[PDB]
Amino acid sequence: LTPRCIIVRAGQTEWSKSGQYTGLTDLPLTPYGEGQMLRTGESVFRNNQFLNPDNITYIFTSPRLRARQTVDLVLKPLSDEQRAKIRVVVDDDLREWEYGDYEGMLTREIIELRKSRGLDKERPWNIWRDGCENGETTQQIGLRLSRAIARIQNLHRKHQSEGRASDIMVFAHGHALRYFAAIWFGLGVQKKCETIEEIQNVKSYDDDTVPYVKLESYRHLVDNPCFLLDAGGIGVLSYAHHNIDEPALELAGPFVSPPE
Amino acid sequence: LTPRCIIVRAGQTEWSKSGQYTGLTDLPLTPYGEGQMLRTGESVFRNNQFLNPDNITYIFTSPRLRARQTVDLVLKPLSDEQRAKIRVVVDDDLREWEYGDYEGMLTREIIELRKSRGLDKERPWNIWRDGCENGETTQQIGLRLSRAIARIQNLHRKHQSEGRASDIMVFAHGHALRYFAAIWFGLGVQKKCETIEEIQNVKSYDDDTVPYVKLESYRHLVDNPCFLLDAGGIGVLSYAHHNIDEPALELAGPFVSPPE
Ligand SMILES: O=P(O)(O)OC[C@@H](O)[C@H]1O[C@](O)(COP(=O)(O)O)[C@@H](O)[C@@H]1O
Numbered sequence: 001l002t003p004r005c006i007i008v009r010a011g012q013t014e015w016s017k018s019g020q021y022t023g024l025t026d027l028p029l030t031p032y033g034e035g036q037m038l039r040t041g042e043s044v045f046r047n048n049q050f051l052n053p054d055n056i057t058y059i060f061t062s063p064r065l066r067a068r069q070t071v072d073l074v075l076k077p078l079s080d081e082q083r084a085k086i087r088v089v090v091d092d093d094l095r096e097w098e099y100g101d102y103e104g105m106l107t108r109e110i111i112e113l114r115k116s117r118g119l120d121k122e123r124p125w126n127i128w129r130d131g132c133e134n135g136e137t138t139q140q141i142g143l144r145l146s147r148a149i150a151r152i153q154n155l156h157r158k159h160q161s162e163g164r165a166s167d168i169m170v171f172a173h174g175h176a177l178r179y180f181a182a183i184w185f186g187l188g189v190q191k192k193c194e195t196i197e198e199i200q201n202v203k204s205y206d207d208d209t210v211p212y213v214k215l216e217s218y219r220h221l222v223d224n225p226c227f228l229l230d231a232g233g234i235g236v237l238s239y240a241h242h243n244i245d246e247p248a249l250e251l252a253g254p255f256v257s258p259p260e
Numbered sequence: 261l262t263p264r265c266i267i268v269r270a271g272q273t274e275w276s277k278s279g280q281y282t283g284l285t286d287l288p289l290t291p292y293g294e295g296q297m298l299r300t301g302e303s304v305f306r307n308n309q310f311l312n313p314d315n316i317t318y319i320f321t322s323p324r325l326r327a328r329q330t331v332d333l334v335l336k337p338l339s340d341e342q343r344a345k346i347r348v349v350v351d352d353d354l355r356e357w358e359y360g361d362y363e364g365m366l367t368r369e370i371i372e373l374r375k376s377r378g379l380d381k382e383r384p385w386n387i388w389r390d391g392c393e394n395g396e397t398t399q400q401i402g403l404r405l406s407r408a409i410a411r412i413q414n415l416h417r418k419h420q421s422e423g424r425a426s427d428i429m430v431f432a433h434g435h436a437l438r439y440f441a442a443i444w445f446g447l448g449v450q451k452k453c454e455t456i457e458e459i460q461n462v463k464s465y466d467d468d469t470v471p472y473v474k475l476e477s478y479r480h481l482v483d484n485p486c487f488l489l490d491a492g493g494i495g496v497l498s499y500a501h502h503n504i505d506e507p508a509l510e511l512a513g514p515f516v517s518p519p520e
């Protein structure tokens with residue numbers, strides 16, 4: 001089977017339901033968000049079989065509690081045996097956009113704050129181009145997500161060459177995963193790794209079974225990719241023509257027609 | 261509810277399963293393709309409820325038999341009452357890329373044919389940029405798909421303003437729907453309608469309840485959007501922030517978490 005990257009956004013939180021920007025703030029899932037992530041896992045493993053546990057090799061997660069809680073609940077339907085054959089890796093490159101000054105704020109409130117600081121005179125604020133004051137720029141996030149992508153695709157290639165199926169999961173956040181999905185299939189711009197930041201190993205994860213990939217170049221966005229992904233939403237990124245060098249977006253998300 | 265465009269690729273055919281390019285050739289579904297589209301409709305309407313019939317207003321279909329067969333089977337689970345409240349429109353702007361010389365051929369055979377005609381000297385053939393000899397260019401397909409999109413989004417806007425939910429379905433083909441999805445959320449390039457071809461009404465459908473939208477500009481691709489969509493696959497295109505002017509791709513395809 002063509003290897004896939006299954007992306008999963010953390011379930012609902014107090015902020016995510018009210019539209020407030022959650023980055024580093026370590027919010028838990030609301031009680032609704034736990035229920036929601038439980039039913040999601042039953043849907044994908046049980047009532048439908050969008051995911052086959054035997055084919056999951058790796059699960060990568062943001063270190064945020066809401067992401068790790070989401071791994072916990074979505075994987076509930078698995079047996080201890082299926083779990084034993086799955087590796088879980090906490091990766092700091094998968095955290096949300098660092099919002100800096102905009103932590104816990106709404107879009108309309110961010111626009112208002114920037115207006116008062118004398119910004120966005122010629123054109124409206126666009127996070128994907130502009131980033132966040134005292135937070136991350138679009139290249140900083142595009143760089144760390146590029147590193148995780150290269151590790152995931154290297155694993156995929158290694159597994160395909162060992163002749164095995166490889167679904168790898170990624171549990172993270174609304175902005176980071178939209179960004180992740182966009183650059184995966186080739187949106188944005190290529191930049192060579194030249195500066196100190198672009199070239200250093202930052203040691204964002206610690207699992208010796210995941211080879212670190214030193215990038216010569218990375219991708220970042222300069223505009224809105226125009227994606228939707230709700231709390232607890234599931235995307236699928238794969239490859240065209242069984243070829244790791246042809247990374248593609250799966251339009252059906254996790255949906256597949258039931259077998260005969 | 262935010263209006264959506266649900267895209268559906270025709271089920272399996274003799275050519276689609278063997279990789280042969282099907283445009284105008286009016287192939288039927290294989291027996292497997294019928295069963296496959298029946299189970300798909302049961303999945304989306306019955307066993308899961310990815311689609312709610314009460315929210316479907318319009319169904320647009322390529323005139324090809326395999327597309328119309330696919331409408332027939334996917335909508336099997338509906339009652340006659342639900343069907344009575346749904347309008348079905350055959351639209352010629354939704355046909356497949358006209359492959360011209362490459363009808364019924366494989367990719368590698370197309371490459372071989374072009375090589376022998378002394379083409380693709382500097383760079384490999386790329387349908388999304390180059391089109392097909394004696395078939396459609398990328399702007400011809402980008403133009404007709406732009407017209408259908410404008411009609412679909414106008415309907416969406418009209419329905420949203422009447423205060424109603426609007427899922428609109430589009431049954432077409434592997435290339436046309438990938439192309440459709442790409443330009444929907446803003447890939448490719450904008451071109452003004454200036455030439456005779458770009459400006460004429462071609463009368464591709466006949467349903468008086470669908471206002472014709474005269475384009476001042478249209479979008480077309482110049483490269484591979486890098487999408488996957490299998491036979492019988494389902495994509496979802498919608499809008500960000502309940503706003504028809506913010507068209508977006510739904511990364512979860514038709515998947516939604518089961519309700520509480
Ligand atoms: O792009 P738009 O739609 O304007 O804004 C959506 C975007 O703001 C969401 O992404 C989040 O990071 C979600 O984070 P989470 O997955 O709960 O950790 C939050 O800051 C937001 O609610």
Ligand SMILES: O=P(O)(O)OC[C@@H](O)[C@H]1O[C@](O)(COP(=O)(O)O)[C@@H](O)[C@@H]1O
Pocket residue numbers: 240269270271273275276279280281282283326356367432433434435491
């Ligand atoms: O882009 P790649 O993957 O190289 O090629 C896939 C593309 O060639 C398919 O799209 C089709 O039009 C399918 O048409 P259908 O939906 O059955 O009417 C056929 O020409 C092909 O099999």
Ligand SMILES: [Mg+2]
Pocket residue numbers: 012013014015016022027066
């Ligand atoms: Mg949150």
Ligand SMILES: [Mg+2]
Pocket residue numbers: 272273274275276282287326
């Ligand atoms: Mg066919």
Ligand code: NA
Pocket residue numbers: 012013014015027028029030
């Ligand atoms: Na919370």
Ligand code: NA
Pocket residue numbers: 009010011012013016066231232
């Ligand atoms: Na969330």
Ligand code: NA
Pocket residue numbers: 410411412414415470471472473
């Ligand atoms: Na219309």
